[PDB]
Design a protein around this ligand. Structure first.
Ligand SMILES: O=C(O)[C@H]1CN(c2ncnc3[nH]c4ccccc4c23)CC12CCC2
Length: 167
């Protein structure tokens, strides 16, 4: 038993809710919140900009030190950093950005990072400003992630389309 509430169950291990991931994280304080990161950990907009804003820019400060030490992530890769006031940990995961011409096949590799964590609160990778089809992103999630994932979908219209079209 965990504290996630109001989710629709899609599969044995995947759950989905129309929710603002920032508000959801503030309420649950999950062990892991997933950020929709880019390789530079520049948290300007989308989910990343919202999560970083909620930490009063502490996420960005930590991220800049990480990059200065380690260099950029790979597309499809991840790193574990602090969750600040939102979660114990933040798993920064880089899905391919279609608006940068990155290979969508890398979306499966991005989701594989979730399997290193027993339970996660997450957005749909590569959705939103990353330019992929969220229905496709949900399909890859269900077909790749084996650990327990609670997906937060900000847009109500999109949430209903994702549920109604789910196979
Ligand atoms: O579900 C989805 O449809 C997308 C929505 N996105 C976002 N994109 C741009 N700015 C944003 N600010 C936010 C503040 C709080 C929560 C989400 C966002 C967000 C990201 C997304 C959450 C799952 C992937």
């Amino acid at each position: 038993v965990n504290s996630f509430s109001g989710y629709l169950k899609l599969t044995d291990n995947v759950y989905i809710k129309n929710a603002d991931i920032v508000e959801e994280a503030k309420k649950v304080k999950p062990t892991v919140v997933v950020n929709a990161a880019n390789v530079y950990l520049k948290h300007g907009g989308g989910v990343a900009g919202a999560l970083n804003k909620a930490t009063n820019n502490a996420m960005q400060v930590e991220s800049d030190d990480y990059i200065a030490t380690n260099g950029p992530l790979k597309v499809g890769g991840s790193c574990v950093l602090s969750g600040h006031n939102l979660a114990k940990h933040c798993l920064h995961v880089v899905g391919p950005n279609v608006n940068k011409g990155e290979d969508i096949q890398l979306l499966k590799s991005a989701y594989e990072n979730f399997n290193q964590h027993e339970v996660l609160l997450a957005p749909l990778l590569s959705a939103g400003i990353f330019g992929a089809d969220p229905i496709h992103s949900l399909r890859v999630c269900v077909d790749t992630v084996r650990t327990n994932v609670y997906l937060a979908v900000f847009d109500k219209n999109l949430y209903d389309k994702l549920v109604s079209s789910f196979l």
